[PDB]
């Protein structure tokens, strides 16, 4: 296959629409890995997505330690 | 309440050099002759690759410090503080803020210089992280510090109202919470005015980003001198080698070629050494920036003149071309007044020392007050402790102490 | 290894060894080849020394950082964030390794959080009450005071609260009762 990235042209890798942690950095936010029996090039995932409940009169207090 | 700006460089520009094109151009005879000098280019490639990976390591260490990406809730009330200029703006396609846009715009037929340098074997590689990812990291850090506080730097993010967070920080610097709870509106107005002044200064002044511009200028000057070195004879007949080959016989052409090769190799060596030194300095700056990010943004620092000039309250990060910008919010006293003091109070033949504050007098009476704010109170046994008689301490004075129990005995 | 391998270069001379150069050419002419070889080898060795100096400087910086970490994290307790580990620092231990040190950091991390409703101050008898070293919480029916980093509810009293001003200036104040521990024993 052929793929056009801002770092050039990539031949031999198939582009997928998922996102994983980077294994081999190619550049411009594009990384590559060996998975599935094949080589897949993907876009980096910064991390999990979270939201915090904020209001005038709410607090969170821990009840245990490690 | 004061807001101060700090600028720190983080990374550099990644470069790659092609030996054969730079030295021998498009001549095959020089290409054949070059092999005699051994392995002089594998070392150069290794050094440049090391610098290139070092830059990405620097950026990743500085910015990637949060495991989860947070978002601010749609409601934008934070106790009167605006924050609308430093939070992401969804309208623009870059998902950036006003100050970030100003900072990026601040630092900047015919053929472009980049193409001309590329056509001689000097190329620039792209960084691993785009600007959007750095913006997302900055937004996540801002959301975490606004909503959770410093709890997200040591575990899970626990929500807390902004006013109570400010009260905790005031307690940290050494002032009680009632000051904030009674001057919330004034503090919010001061913060908004300071942010507006920062806006005006950024929009007007164009010389506050010197360090990143100096980095860019140094890189440009190094490339310029490397390119200019190609047009010097080094003691030969001419710089152009085809004329040397055509004009005169091989016996002296070999000497001329050797002179040119030695000169160009020496120039490349000098360039690599200067690049190594500059990269070391940039890495030191990046380490300092990472430490500052971990100490001033994810917590409160007691160190003096580290996270701002004054008493530190908190800080905010923003991105910049090849660098980071810190907005420090700090506390400074004003409108001071003179008073008369004593070290202890001798009452009932016993010495009395304050528990937290200091003793003051306004001319006739005596009070106890906190250190960083004028708030007098009557000297009682609840805010005083006794140790020994009053004939040893130098400078003790006479007064009376109030006991909150005897009034209740008779009433 | 690369310094050793550089010895096979010719640097434009007729051979990579000296004895054959001295055993094939007259003294008037061998000088140019000897000069070329000597200059090349000197340049290689100088480059090696310079790179060694730069690497030594970096190692010195790392050693200074390790010394500071040993001074603060091990011999004492550090309040710096993310310096002696992730979390709240408790203590640390050193161990040795070939050309390096290994630090084991023992730290404290909260877990098992729970939601609560809070107010900044309590209005009682026309006066505002603030916590001393805690925070006000409520479980939907009653009110308590608890420490920040652990759950330990307690009854609001005079001993753990202080008063300043009226209760018509603080935003978010609520009405409740503050228990006086002097009258009940006085009236008994």
UniProtKB/Swiss-Prot annotation, chain B:
Effect the entry attributes to changing residue 365 to Y: In strain: Theta/P.3
Residue segments, region Heptad repeat 1: 184-234
**Annotated glycosylation sites:** 82, 338, 362, 398
Q: What is the effect of changing residue 152 to L?
A: In strain: Eta/B.1.525
Please give the coiled-coil regions recorded for this protein.
213-257
Q: What is the effect of changing residue 246 to A?
A: In strain: Alpha/B.1.1.7
What are the annotated disulfide bridges?
A: 19-41, 24-30, 296-307, 346-390
User: What residues does the record give for site: Cleavage?
Assistant: 96-97
Q: What is the effect of changing residue 335 to H?
A: In strain: Kappa/B.1.617.1
Chain's role: Precursor of the fusion protein processed in the biosynthesis of the S protein and the formation of virus particle. Mediates fusion of the virion and cellular membranes by functioning as a class I viral fusion protein. Contains two viral fusion peptides that are unmasked after cleavage. The S2/S2' cleavage occurs during virus entry at the cell membrane by host TMPRSS2 or during endocytosis by host CSTL.
- Name of this protein: Spike protein S2
Q: What is the lineage of its organism?
A: Viruses, Riboviria, Orthornavirae, Pisuviricota, Pisoniviricetes
Swiss-Prot record, chain C:
- Protein task: Subunit of the fusion protein that is processed upon entry into the host cell. Mediates fusion of the virion and cellular membranes by functioning as a class I viral fusion protein. Contains a viral fusion peptide that is unmasked after S2 cleavage. This cleavage can occur at the cell membrane by host TMPRSS2 or during endocytosis by host CSTL. In either case, this triggers an extensive and irreversible conformational change that leads to fusion of the viral envelope with the cellular cytoplasmic membrane, releasing viral genomic RNA into the host cell cytoplasm.
Query: Where in the full protein does the shown chain start and end, and how long is the full protein?
Result: 960 to 1147 of 1273
Q: Which residues are glycosylated?
A: 115, 139, 175
Residues in coiled coil: 1-34
**Listed result of changing residue 68 to I:** In strain: Gamma/P.1
Q: Which organism is it from?
A: Severe acute respiratory syndrome coronavirus 2 (2019-nCoV)
Name of protein = Spike protein S2'
What are the disulphide bonds in this sequence?
73-84, 123-167
Q: Which domain of life is it from?
A: Viruses
């Amino acid at each position: 296959n052929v793929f056009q990235t801002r770092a050039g042209c990539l031949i031999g890798a198939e582009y997928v629409n998922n996102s994983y942690e980077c294994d081999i950095p190619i550049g411009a936010g594009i990384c590559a890995s060996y998975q599935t029996q094949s080589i897949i090039a993907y876009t980096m995932s910064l991390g999990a997505e979270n939201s915090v409940a904020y209001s005038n009169n709410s607090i969170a207090i821990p009840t245990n330690f490690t | 309440i004061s807001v101060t700006t700090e600028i720190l460089p983080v990374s550099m520009t990644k470069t790659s050099v092609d030996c054969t094109m730079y030295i021998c151009g498009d001549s095959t005879e020089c290409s054949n002759l070059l092999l005699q000098y051994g392995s002089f280019c594998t070392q150069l490639k290794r050094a440049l690759t090391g610098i290139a990976v070092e830059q990405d390591k620097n950026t990743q260490e500085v910015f990637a410090q949060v495991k989860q990406i947070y978002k601010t809730p749609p409601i934008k009330y934070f106790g009167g503080f605006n924050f609308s200029q430093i939070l992401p703006d969804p309208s623009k396609p870059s998902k950036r803020s006003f100050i970030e846009d100003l900072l990026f715009n601040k630092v900047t037929a015919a053929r472009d210089l980049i193409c001309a340098q590329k056509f001689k074997g000097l190329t620039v590689l792209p960084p691993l992280l785009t600007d959007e990812m750095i913006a997302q990291y900055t937004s996540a850090l801002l959301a975490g510090t606004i909503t959770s506080g410093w709890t997200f730097g040591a575990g899970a993010a626990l929500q807390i109202p902004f006013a109570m967070q400010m009260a905790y920080r005031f307690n940290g610097i050494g002032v009680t919470q009632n000051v904030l709870y009674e001057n919330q509106k004034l503090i919010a107005n001061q913060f908004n005015s300071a942010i507006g002044k920062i806006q005006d200064s950024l929009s007007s002044t164009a010389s506050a980003l010197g360090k990143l511009q100096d980095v860019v200028n140094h890189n440009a000057q190094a490339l310029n001198t490397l390119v200019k070195q190609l047009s010097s004879k080094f003691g030969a007949i001419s710089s152009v080698l085809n004329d040397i080959f055509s004009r005169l016989d091989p016996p002296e052409a070999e000497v001329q070629i050797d002179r040119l090769i030695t000169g160009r190799l020496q120039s490349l060596q000098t360039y690599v050494t200067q690049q190594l030194i500059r990269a070391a300095e940039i890495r030191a700056s990046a380490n300092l920036a990472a430490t500052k990010m971990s100490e001033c943004v994810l917590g409160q620092s007691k160190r003096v003149d580290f996270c701002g000039k004054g008493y530190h309250l908190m800080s905010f990060p923003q991105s910049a071309p090849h660098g980071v910008v810190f907005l420090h919010v700090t506390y400074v006293p004003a409108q001071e007044k003179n008073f008369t003091t004593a070290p202890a109070i001798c009452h009932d033949g016993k010495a009395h020392f304050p528990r937290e504050g200091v003793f003051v007098s306004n001319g006739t009476h005596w009070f106890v007050t906190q250190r960083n704010f004028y708030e007098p109170q009557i000297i009682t046994t609840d805010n005083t402790f006794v140790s020994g008689n009053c004939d040893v301490v130098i400078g003790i004075v006479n007064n009376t102490v109030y006991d909150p129990l005897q009034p209740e005995l008779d009433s």
